[PDB]
C-alpha cells in the first residue's frame, strides 16, 4: 500500500457524534436565537467555529497547472544503476519507492476543462530513504522560453487578457500569439501544443520529460548528463479538437475521472523510467546545447535506458489534503543528481520554494502528511506559522559544544551527504546575457513537424488556424505568418489560407527534411485496450436490451468498459440518451434493434434532446472512433450516410462486430475521415 | 463616469523603462550569470524581485460563486423616499449614485463554465454619500436553505465529492441530490434551478432578488417589511440544456463577455430597482413566514413599487483589482 | 506526566545527520559559491531552505497579554460534583485532568519586562474527556469596563501613544489616565493593579479568577450562577515599586524564570479551584449586578468552595511550540457550563476565535498539537490552510442517507451533547445601551481600599502619585482628582499634593466605611518558604566562604535556593558580585568576614562596580526583606545604617539567623520601613 505511512493521520467520523474542533459533543443544526423568531446571539460558538473553518476553506490556487488530478504508487528499479548514480532509490534491483503524482493542465483555473488544449504536466514524487525526489515534468519534452526570468511574461501572455479575463484556458487569442511570434524561441513547444500532445486522451496515455539536461553522479564525483522519460505501458493516444471542446462542456473531469476509474477498477496505469545518457563532452555535439530546454535530443543519438517502472495503484482518500496541497519542486534534489546551468531551470529553484509561500501561507509546507518524506528531518530550523513539532534539541545552532555536534555535517565523504558535481567549474564574465549556442529557433521545429504522419501533420495545422483566426490584430497575425514560415513554407502557405493573407516567398535558411523517431502519437497503434469505452446504442422497445446486454458481457471480458444506453434506465440500462454523448466513449455500436431510435417516432422523444442518438453515432464516426452495428441496426448507418466499406466501420452478426471494434480501438483513430491540403 | 473616484490609482506604463518596484531602471530579460553558459546568481536582485510578484499573484477564490464578472454603473432614484426610508441614496429625485455590480454562479471554481446549470448571483454595491450599501442578492427569489448554520453542509454536499473532487460546478451527482432529498426546505430553489432560471442567456437577461425581508426605516422610526427587486430592461430569456452544455465547452466566458461586449458596444444594460413593501403586523399574514427565506410573496398580494433605475456602463480596467 | 499526549510530535535530532526540511543528508555551513571568491549561486538549494525557514520564524504575538509564560500540570477534583454541575472534569473524587497554564501581563509586547505594573493573566486549559475547557482569567477580579465593545478603547489608552510608541509596558501616561477619568467604570480595577497585584513576587504567589459570572448547570438543566477563583497554596506576595522597576533592567525574565525554576526543581506550585455559587433569582440581590464585570462578590456574602487542586508540574520542551502557540479562548466550553449576559463576556467569545485567524494566519490552529483535545474531533469541516489530517467520511454534510447520519447530532439528552441553560429568556426591545443597575462606579473601589492594611493603602496612593505625576496636561489631571474624590476624599487629597493640586471637597455620595476579607496581601504571612530565595554576601578572602558552604548547607535544608556571593567564582561561589542585585533575592544575609568589602580597601575593586557590596544590603533594606549578618559581619549593617534589633534584622551567630531570616521570610515584606503620610509632620 503506497498510503501506508499516511493512515496515521487518517480521520474515522463512522458511527461518531458531531464535536467542535476543541471537542465535545454537540448539534449544529440550528443557531442559538433569542425566542421563537428571535436574532441569532453572539454567544452562538458551535455557529461560530462551524462557519469559520467553511469561510476559510479556500487556499490560493498553484499560480500556473492550477487544474490537476494525482494518485499514489510504487516505483521499482529494474537493476543496481550505482555505475551511472549515487541515488539510492535506483541502488538495488527490485527496490520499490512509494511515489505520488500530480497530472495537469498549465494556463486554466481551477474548475477549468480537463479537454483544453495546452501543454501537461507530469510531476512525480519519489519518497526515496535519502529524502524526496521530485521529476517535475511535462508531457512535452522541451519548453517556450530558455530564461527563466521570462516565465511571467509567457504565463500573462498566454493567461486570460488582465481587463476581462477572457479567455479561460485558451492560446488563441492575441496576446499569447503576440508573444509566440515576438519570442520566437516559442515555436518549438507551440508546434508540440498544436499536435496531438494539447489534447491527449488521457493522463494514461501520455509521456512525460523532464526536460532538462541534469546530472547523474556516483560515489566518485563522476557525472553524466541526463534526460529523464516516461513511457507509457497504455501508448499514446489523443483526442480531435472538435471532440475535445465539446467534452470540456459534457465532461470537465474527463480526465480526473479517467485516471480515478482505472485505478479503482485494478486496471493501475504504468510508465518506464528511461534516461538519455550523455558524456560531458558531449553537451555541443548534436547541433545544438544541451543546456536548451527548447531542444531535445534526438533518440538516434542516445537511445532510451530504462532503469524501472511505476505503476499508480492507490487513489487519494481526501483530493484536497493530498492533491490539492502537494508541493512539488525541482529543488527537491537528492544524492546522485546535480542540476545544470540551463539558465531556465536555474530560476525555477527558487520560484518553486518561494510560491508555497503564498499557497500555504506559512514555512512549514513540508510538514504536511502528503509533503513529509519518509527518511526523517534532523536540522536546526524551529518556529514558523503552523509549527508541528517539538524539538528536543534546545542547541538549536552549530557549530556547538553543547549540542555534541549533532545533527552533524554531511558530504561526498561522510554521512552520504548531497554534494554538488566536483569537476563544475565557472569562467568568464558576469553576465545578463544568453549563450550563442542558443540561438536557433526554427530547425527543431521543422524537425518535430517532419516527424509526424501526413494527417498528424493536418491536426497541427488545422489547430493553427483555428487558434491564430482568434487573433483580431492584423500585424501579429501577419508576425506569426512570417516565423512559421521559417520553419516550413508549406506550412506558411497552409495556415496563410485560412487567415486570408499572401503565401510568404520561401526562407530556406533552416529548411531541412531530417525526420526522428519516438514524437508521433498516430504513427502507432495502442498496445492495450483494456479500460477503453464502448457506447452501446440501445432502446428499451422489444428485444433490443438483452441483445445488447450479451454484447456487453463479451466486450466487458477483453477490459473494456461498457455502457449500455436507452432512452431511460430499464434493467440493465447504464445510462440515458439524455446523458450520453460520444465524448465519453473510444467506439459507439448501436445493437441489433435500436436503429428504431435513428428515424421517425422513436427518434422524436420527450426523455432526450431531438435527434440524440444520430448525434451519438454521427459524432463518433466524425471524431476517427470505431463504430458498429449489429444486424438490422446497420440501417442506423446508413440514415447518417456511413458505409461498412469504411476502414473502422464494422456491421454483421454479434461476433463479428466485437472482433472489428476490438481492433479498430488498437488503432484508436481512423485517420481516413479527415481531411487534407490538396489531396 | 461611474470609475472616476479611481483614476488616482490607475498607472500608465506606455512611453516608460522598465523599472523595479521600488523604482530605478532595469532591464528584465536575462538572468545575471557567472560566465557564458553558466549558473544564475543570487545576486540578481532583478531577477528575484520579478519572480517574487509572479510567485506571489493568486489569492483565495471567493468560497461560493468563485466564477463571476461584473462592471460599474450608476443607480438614479426616481423620488424622494423619504416617507418610506431614511436611507440617503433614495432622498430625492434624479439623485444619482455610483454603483458595481457583479454576477456569478455559486458552485464552480475560478475556471469553471459560465453555462453550467447553477443558481446565479448578482451582487450590487450602492456607494453612497451616507456609507456603502450592498445588496447581495441571486437571480432566484428563495433559497435552499432556512438558517445559516446549515451552509456549510449545503455547499458541501453540492460542491465537488471530496475524495476525487469530481464533478465540476454541477448538481448532477449523488451527495447533492441526497441533501436535497434530506432536507426538503432545498426543493423550492431547487425546481427554480432546473427551470430556466439555472440556465439563463446572459446576466443582462436576469432578474435580481434580495430573498430576505429586510426593514426600511423613516428618520422618526417607522418601519416597513421590504423585499428587494431587480427588474432586467432587456427582458428574461433563458438557453436549453443541451446548448448549454456544448456552450460550456465552446466558449467558458460566454456570459463575461456578452456583458463586456454590451457596455463597450454602448448598449449598457439597466435594471430597475423595486420593492415590496409589507406592514410589520402583516409578517405572517399571506400563508407562511416572511422570515422564512424559502418562501417568496406573491406579486398578487403586494405588487412592485419601482423606487428607481440602474445602469451599468463602464468595464473594469483592471479585472483582479476591481472584479 | 501531563505532557504525555505531545511525546508523539517530538523530534530528536542527537546522533543523527543534518537534513533538509523534505529529507536527505546535508552540510548548511558554506554557501555554494561561483569560483573559491566567487558569488552565491541560485542553485544552492541548501542554503534557501534554511534560510527561508529563519526568515519566516516569527508570528504575531498576542494582541493584549503578548508578554507571559506557561507550564503543563495535572488538575485533580476533590469530589463527585455533579449535584452542581454536569461537568466531566468535576465529575469523580480524584479524577485527574491535564491542564496548561499561561500567566502574563497585558499591556507589554513580546520582549517587555515581567515586572512591570500591569493587571496579570492567569489562562488554563482542562483537557477534559469532553473536550477543552478554558477559563481565561486575570490575577484581580474585576476589569476595567462593563461592554466589550469598548476593550479597543480601553487597550489603545494604556498601550504606547501611536506617534512614538512609548511608554513600554506602562499606564503611567497621559492616554491611559485620560481614559480611567473618562471611563469610570475603570477606577476598580485601577485600584487593583495600583496595590500589590500590580506587582506580584511571582506568578506562583498570585490568586486567579474568572471574573465574569458563568452558570454550572446540571444534566436534567438547572443552572446555578458561578464565579472561579484560584487560591494559591504558596501564599499572595508582592514587591514595592522602586524595587520592581530596578527588576525590570536586572532580570526581565524574573517570573518566567521563577516559574521554570520552582518546576525544575521539584517545588511544583498548586492553587485550588474554589467557586461562589449563587441562585438564579438573586443575581442583583448583593447591591449590584452580578452580569457586571466591573463587581466582585464579597465573600461575607457568598464563601468559596473549594472543588480541587491544580498542581504545575512540568516545563514546556519547547517555549514557541507550545507557550507562545496555545490558542485560549473563553468561548472553549464543555457541557455543565454556560454563559451569562455579561456584556463584557458576550464580546469576548467573538474576540478570541477571530484573532486566532490573526496570530496562526490560518483556521486550522486547534489542530496544532498544544491545542489538541484529547477527546477527539469528529464533523464535517474540511480544507483550509494547514490541513493536517485526511477525512475518510466523503458525504461531509448533514442531513444525509449516504453516511447514515454519521457524525451524528448530540444534545442535553443524546450523546452528551452541549446545551443552553433551559431556563434562559430574553426579555424587551433591541437596544444599544447598558442596564442602570450597571451605574455605581465608586463604591466597590472604595471597598477595596478600605479593605488593605495602612501601609498596603499608602502603597496604592503612592502608585498613583506615581503614575498621575507622568500627565503632562494639567486637566486630565484635575479629572483624575475629581474621580479619586468620588470614591475617597483622604485618597483625593493625598494624591493632590504630589501633583501639587488643590485638596478637593468632600463629594459624599458614595462613601463608606465597609471592607471585605480576601483582597488584601501584606495582612498575611506566607504558609511556606520553599523555593524563596537567599543572597549570601560573602567575600574570597579569609575564611567567610566555608562559613558561608555551611550557611547554605543548612538554609537549603528547608527548601531555600541559595547564592553565595563573591567577588570571582571561588570553589563554592555561585555568583560574583558584579553579576548580583538584591531584586534577585528575597532575603541579604552577610557572612562572617564579608565586612571586607563593605569598606575600606575591599570596596573597591576592578571586578565589581564601586560600591556593589553595600548597595545590594541597602536595596533589600530598603526594600522590606529580611536581612542579616553572622557574627562580625554585624559591621556591614553599621555600615549602611541599619540597627541591628530592628523588625527584619537578625544578627548573632550562624544558628540564630538561620532561624531569625527564615521567620522574616514568611512575614516577607516588613512594612515598618515604609512612611505613611503624615509621619514626617512636626
Ligand atoms: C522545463 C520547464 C518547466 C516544466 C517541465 C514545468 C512543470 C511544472 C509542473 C508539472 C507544475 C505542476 C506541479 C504540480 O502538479 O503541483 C508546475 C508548477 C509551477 N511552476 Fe513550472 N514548469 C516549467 C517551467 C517553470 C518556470 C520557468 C517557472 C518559474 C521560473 C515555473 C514556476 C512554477 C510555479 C511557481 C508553479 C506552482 C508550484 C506550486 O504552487 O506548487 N515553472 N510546473
Ligand atoms: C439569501 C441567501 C444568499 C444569497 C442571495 C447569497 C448570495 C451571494 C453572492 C451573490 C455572493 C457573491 C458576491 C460576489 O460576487 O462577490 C456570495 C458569496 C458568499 N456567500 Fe452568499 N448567499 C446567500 C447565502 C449565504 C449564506 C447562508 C452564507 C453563510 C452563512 C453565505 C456565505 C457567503 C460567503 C462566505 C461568500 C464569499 C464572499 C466573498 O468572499 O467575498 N451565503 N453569496
Ligand atoms: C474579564 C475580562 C478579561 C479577562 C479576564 C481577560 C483575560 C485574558 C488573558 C489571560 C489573555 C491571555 C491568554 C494567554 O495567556 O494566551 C487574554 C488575551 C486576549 N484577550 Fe482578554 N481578557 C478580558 C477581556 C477581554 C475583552 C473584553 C476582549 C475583547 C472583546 C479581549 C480580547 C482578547 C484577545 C483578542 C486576546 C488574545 C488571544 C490570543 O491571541 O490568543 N479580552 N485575555
Redesign the interface.
Known amino acids: 500500500d503506497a498510503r501506508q505511512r499516511?493512515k496515521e493521520?487518517?480521520?474515522?467520523?463512522?458511527?461518531?457524534?458531531?464535536?467542535?474542533?476543541?471537542?465535545?459533543?454537540?448539534?449544529?443544526?440550528?443557531?442559538?436565537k433569542?425566542?421563537g423568531?428571535?436574532?441569532?446571539l453572539?454567544?452562538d460558538?458551535?455557529?461560530?467555529?462551524?462557519?469559520?473553518?467553511?469561510?476559510?476553506?479556500?487556499?490560493?490556487?498553484?499560480?500556473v497547472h492550477?487544474?490537476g488530478?494525482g494518485a499514489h504508487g510504487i516505483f521499482t528499479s529494474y537493476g543496481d544503476w550505482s555505475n551511472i548514480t549515487a541515488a539510492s532509490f535506483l541502488g538495488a534491483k527490485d527496490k520499490q519507492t512509494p511515489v505520488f503524482v500530480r497530472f495537469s493542465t498549465v494556463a486554466?483555473?481551477?474548475?477549468?476543462?480537463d479537454?483544453a488544449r495546452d501543454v501537461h504536466g507530469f510531476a512525480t514524487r519519489f519518497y526515496?530513504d535519502?529524502?524526496?525526489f521530485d521529476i517535475v515534468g511535462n508531457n512535452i519534452p522541451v519548453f517556450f522560453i530558455q530564461?527563466?526570468?521570462?516565465?511571467?511574461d509567457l504565463?500573462h501572455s498566454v493567461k486570460?487578457s488582465?481587463?476581462?479575463?477572457?479567455?479561460?484556458?485558451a492560446t488563441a487569442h492575441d496576446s499569447a500569439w503576440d508573444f509566440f511570434s515576438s519570442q520566437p524561441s516559442a515555436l518549438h513547444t507551440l508546434f508540440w501544443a498544436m499536435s496531438g500532445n494539447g489534447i491527449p486522451r488521457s493522463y494514461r496515455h501520455m509521456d512525460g520529460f523532464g526536460i532538462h539536461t541534469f546530472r547523474l553522479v556516483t560515489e566518485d564525483g563522476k557525472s553524466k548528463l541526463v534526460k529523464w522519460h516516461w513511457k507509457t505501458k497504455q501508448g499514446k493516444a489523443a483526442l480531435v479538437w472538435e471532440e475535445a471542446?465539446?467534452?470540456?462542456?459534457?465532461?470537465?473531469?474527463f480526465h480526473?475521472?479517467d485516471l480515478?476509474d482505472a485505478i479503482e477498477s485494478g486496471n493501475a496505469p504504468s510508465w518506464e523510467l528511461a534516461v538519455q545518457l550523455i558524456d560531458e563532452d558531449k553537451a555541443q555535439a548534436y547541433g545544438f546545447?544541451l543546456?536548451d530546454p527548447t531542444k531535445f535530443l534526438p533518440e538516434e543519438f542516445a537511445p532510451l535506458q530504462v532503469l524501472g517502472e511505476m505503476t499508480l495503484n492507490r487513489?487519494?482518500?481526501?483530493?484536497?489534503?493530498?492533491?490539492?496541497?502537494i508541493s512539488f519542486?525541482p529543488?527537491?534534489?537528492?544524492?546522485g543528481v546535480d542540476?545544470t546551468?540551463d539558465?531556465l531551470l536555474?530560476?525555477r529553484?527558487?520560484?518553486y520554494?518561494?510560491?508555497q509561500?503564498?499557497?500555504?501561507?506559512?514555512?512549514?509546507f513540508?510538514?504536511?502528511?502528503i509533503?513529509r518524506?519518509?527518511?526523517?528531518?534532523?536540522?536546526?530550523?524551529?518556529?514558523?506559522?503552523?509549527?508541528?513539532?517539538?524539538?528536543?534539541?534546545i542547541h538549536h545552532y552549530?557549530?556547538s559544544y553543547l549540542?555534541?555536534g549533532?545533527?552533524?555535517?554531511?558530504?561526498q565523504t561522510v554521512?552520504?551527504?548531497?554534494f554538488?558535481t566536483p569537476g563544475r567549474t565557472?569562467?568568464?564574465?558576469?553576465?545578463?546575457?544568453?549563450?550563442a549556442?542558443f540561438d536557433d529557433h526554427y530547425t527543431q521545429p521543422r524537425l518535430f513537424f517532419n516527424s509526424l504522419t501526413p494527417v498528424e501533420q493536418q491536426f497541427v495545422i488545422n489547430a493553427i488556424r483555428f487558434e491564430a483566426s482568434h487573433v483580431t490584430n492584423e500585424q501579429v497575425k501577419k508576425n506569426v505568418l512570417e516565423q512559421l514560415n521559417k520553419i516550413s513554407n508549406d506550412v506558411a502557405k497552409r495556415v496563410a489560407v485560412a487567415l486570408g493573407l499572401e503565401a510568404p516567398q520561401p526562407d530556406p535558411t533552416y529548411y531541412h527534411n531530417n525526420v526522428t523517431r519516438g514524437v508521433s502519437i498516430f504513427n502507432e497503434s495502442l498496445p492495450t485496450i483494456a479500460t477503453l469505452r464502448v457506447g452501446v446504442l440501445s432502446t428499451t422497445k422489444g428485444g433490443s436490451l438483452d441483445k445488447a446486454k450479451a454484447l456487453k458481457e463479451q466486450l466487458e471480458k477483453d477490459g473494456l468498459k461498457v455502457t449500455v444506453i436507452a432512452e431511460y434506465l430499464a434493467s440493465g440500462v447504464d445510462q440515458t440518451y439524455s446523458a450520453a454523448d460520444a465524448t465519453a466513449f473510444d467506439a459507439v455500436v448501436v445493437a441489433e434493434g435500436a436503429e428504431r431510435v435513428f428515424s421517425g417516432k422513436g427518434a422524436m422523444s420527450p426523455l432526450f434532446?431531438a435527434g440524440?442518438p444520430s448525434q451519438i453515432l454521427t459524432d463518433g464516426y466524425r471524431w476517427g472512433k470505431p463504430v458498429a452495428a449489429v444486424g438490422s441496426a446497420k440501417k442506423a448507418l446508413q440514415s447518417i450516410g456511413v458505409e461498412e466499406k469504411e476502414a473502422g466501420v464494422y456491421a454483421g452478426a454479434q461476433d463479428e462486430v466485437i472482433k472489428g471494434v476490438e481492433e479498430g480501438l488498437k488503432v484508436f483513430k481512423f485517420l481516413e475521415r479527415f481531411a487534407v491540403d490538396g489531396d
Open positions: 499516511l493521520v487518517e480521520v474515522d467520523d463512522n458511527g461518531q457524534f458531531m464535536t467542535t474542533d476543541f471537542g465535545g459533543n454537540i448539534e449544529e443544526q440550528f443557531s442559538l433569542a425566542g423568531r428571535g436574532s441569532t453572539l454567544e460558538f458551535i455557529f461560530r467555529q462551524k462557519l469559520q473553518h467553511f469561510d476559510h476553506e479556500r487556499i490560493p490556487e498553484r499560480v492550477a487544474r488530478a486554466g483555473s481551477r474548475g477549468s476543462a479537454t526515496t535519502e529524502g524526496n530564461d527563466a526570468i521570462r516565465f511571467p504565463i486570460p488582465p481587463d476581462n479575463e477572457v479567455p479561460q484556458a471542446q465539446v467534452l470540456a462542456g459534457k465532461n470537465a473531469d480526473r475521472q480515478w546545447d543546456l487513489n487519494p482518500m481526501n483530493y484536497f489534503a493530498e492533491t490539492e496541497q519542486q529543488g527537491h534534489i537528492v544524492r542540476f546551468e539558465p536555474q530560476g529553484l527558487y520560484s520554494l518561494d510560491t509561500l503564498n499557497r500555504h501561507r506559512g514555512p512549514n513540508e510538514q504536511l502528511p509533503n518524506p519518509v527518511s526523517g528531518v534532523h536540522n536546526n530550523h524551529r518556529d514558523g506559522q503552523g509549527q508541528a513539532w517539538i524539538h528536543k534539541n552549530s557549530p549540542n555534541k549533532y545533527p552533524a555535517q554531511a558530504n554521512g552520504r551527504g548531497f554538488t565557472a569562467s568568464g564574465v558576469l553576465n545578463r546575457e544568453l549563450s549556442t434532446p440524440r
